Design a protein around this ligand. Structure first.
Ligand SMILES: Nc1ncnc2c1ncn2[C@@H]1O[C@H](COP(=O)(O)OP(=O)(O)NP(=O)(O)O)[C@@H](O)[C@H]1O
Ligand SMILES: CC(=O)N[C@@H]1[C@@H](O)[C@H](O)[C@@H](CO)O[C@@H]1O
Length: 355
């Protein structure tokens, strides 16, 4: 594997002699490596072509978004071209790209304090304003039905019916949760379809670890993981951030007694996010901010459970029950979100008042 990785790196216009190439992060989707040279560092990624089969359109999107950010003077992912001059390469059956390593940054897999999450809100709120500069038609959907929760639920039911590994028998309570909540999945798609929720270009994977913060100041430096930028609703970006970051625990926390929905963290993110968007957010969008957290958490939880039932073909895992463990944290969070619905509505109202 090491020899193969060094060979891959040799296809790119790196500006130093490679000393090591090692797995970096715990991403579920692409395979990411840190390339350390005698000078600069790089991120080398093998794109998951099972999930992103249309590499040409994916890289066209990434090139467009990054070049636009650069034209505005913003720090972003800097593609390092192949020695042949291309934005990526097919090498020995894999699709590979390289970015410059963004130095002097911190990222977080869990909110350590409310200020970090407030800053995350500012960063993703600001990113909505950036993406509003694009026509929906400029950025291709890299994955269809991506936050179409009813479509995700159809996929879940298919996984359940197939029950390829006989795993359904051991996750009855979790299956029942997603079945019983089925009435709740259509709200955003219904509003997009009838024009009552604006169709906007969105990031679509707004977990906290997709923001790099400055290692000294804590100020957002750059939003990363640009692979799912495509038309959607602002509510997908807000709700997914709340899913991941308003939790008191890791997404794959095995001890459910550590998992809670924090209204303090909800408030911190809301203050940052709405602060960037207050005069643009529609009445209907504002009405749905609290529930968007429930919706995206249920969608992701359902996807984890579907993957568990399918033998973990979608998300990377470290052990057999990993996706079940992930699905369970999402369920616990939704149950707590339901209990705090009046509070979160009040928080949104207060932020709307003070901004
Ligand atoms: N340009 C960069 N500079 C520094 N770190 C980076 C850069 N690009 C990616 N990373 C790191 O790579 C890891 C995540 O890569 P990412 O492309 O977000 O993974 P993904 O698999 O496509 N999505 P997911 O698997 O669900 O996390 C994180 O640990 C980031 O800190
Ligand atoms: C391309 C893709 O499926 N990305 C997913 C994202 O949708 C999901 O919310 C997250 C859960 O941690 O894992 C990945 O980042």
């Amino acid at each position: 594997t090491n020899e193969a990785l060094f060979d891959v790196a040799s296809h790119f216009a790196l500006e130093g002699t490679v000393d090591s190439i090692e797995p970096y992060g715990d991403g579920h989707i692409n395979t990411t490596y840190l390339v350390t040279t005698d000078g600069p560092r790089y991120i080398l990624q093998r794109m998951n072509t099972g999930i992103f089969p249309d590499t040409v359109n994916l890289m066209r999107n990434v090139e467009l978004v990054t070049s636009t950010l650069k034209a505005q003077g913003k720090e972003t992912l800097d593609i390092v071209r192949t020695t042949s001059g291309d934005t990526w390469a097919e090498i020995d059956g894999g699709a590979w790209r390289v970015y410059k390593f963004i130095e002097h940054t911190m990222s977080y897999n869990l909110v350590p304090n409310p200020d970090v999450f407030r800053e995350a809100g500012r960063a993703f709120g600001d990113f909505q304003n950036f993406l509003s500069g694009f026509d929906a038609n400029q950025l291709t959907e890299t994955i269809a039905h991506f936050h179409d929760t009813p479509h995700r639920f159809e996929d879940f039911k298919k996984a359940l019916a197939a029950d390829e590994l006989g795993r359904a028998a051991g996750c009855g309570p979790e299956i029942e949760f997603y079945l019983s909540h089925a009435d709740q999945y259509a709200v955003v798609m219904d509003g997009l379809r009838d024009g009552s929720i604006p169709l906007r270009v969105t990031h679509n994977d707004t977990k906290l670890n997709n923001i790099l913060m400055d290692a000294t100041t804590g100020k957002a430096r750059a939003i990363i993981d640009l692979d799912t930028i495509m038309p959607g609703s602002m509510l997908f970006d807000f709700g997914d951030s709340i899913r991941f970051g308003a939790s008191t625990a890791l997404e794959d926390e095995r001890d459910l007694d550590k998992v809670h929905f924090s209204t303090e963290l909800f408030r911190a993110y809301t203050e940052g996010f709405v602060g960037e968007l207050r005069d643009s957010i529609t009445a209907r969008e504002a009405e749905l901010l609290p529930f968007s957290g429930n919706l995206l958490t249920m969608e992701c939880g359902m996807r984890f459970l579907a993957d568990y039932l399918e033998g973990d073909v979608y998300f990377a895992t470290k052990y057999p029950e990993h996706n079940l463990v992930r699905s369970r944290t999402q369920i616990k969070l939704v149950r707590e979100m339901e209990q705090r619905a009046d509070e979160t509505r009040a928080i949104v109202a207060d932020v709307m008042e003070t901004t």
